[PDB]
Each structure stands twice: as C-alpha cells, then as structure tokens.
Design a protein around this ligand. Structure first.
Ligand SMILES: [Zn+2]
Ligand SMILES: [Zn+2]
Length: 63
C-alpha cells in the first residue's frame, strides 16, 4: 500500500498504461508523452541509445 498521486496525469503510451513488459521513451526531453511501449512501435528489441516515437520520427521521414 503506497497509492501515490504526485503525477496529476499518470499513463502516457498509446496503451495508456505502464508497468507491463519492457519500456522505452522518445529521447526528446520535450516529448509530451515521454515513454512508449516496446509494442507502441512494434520494436520487440533495443534500437539504440537514441530513439523517437511514431510522431517525433514522422517530422523527419528520410528512411
Ligand atoms: Zn503502450
Ligand atoms: Zn515521443
């Protein structure tokens, strides 16, 4: 029993729920969502030490 309330806006992914499987997050420190599931992009694996969500990456579709 701990039930915190400090985040006035909990959950953020396209799944709107956290603490399930593994996690990522768009490396943009101004991302309005911050974290994303390894299946909110269908990653299944670690991409690199730099990633972007399917909205941050859409701004530079260059392959
Ligand atoms: Zn998700
Ligand atoms: Zn993002």
């Amino acid at each position: 029993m701990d039930m915190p309330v400090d985040p006035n806006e909990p959950t953020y992914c396209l799944c709107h729920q956290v603490s399930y499987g593994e996690m990522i997050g768009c490396d943009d420190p101004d991302c309005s969502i911050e974290w994303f599931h390894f299946a909110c992009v269908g990653l299944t694996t670690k991409p690199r030490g730099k990633w972007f969500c399917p909205r941050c990456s859409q701004e530079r579709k260059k392959k």
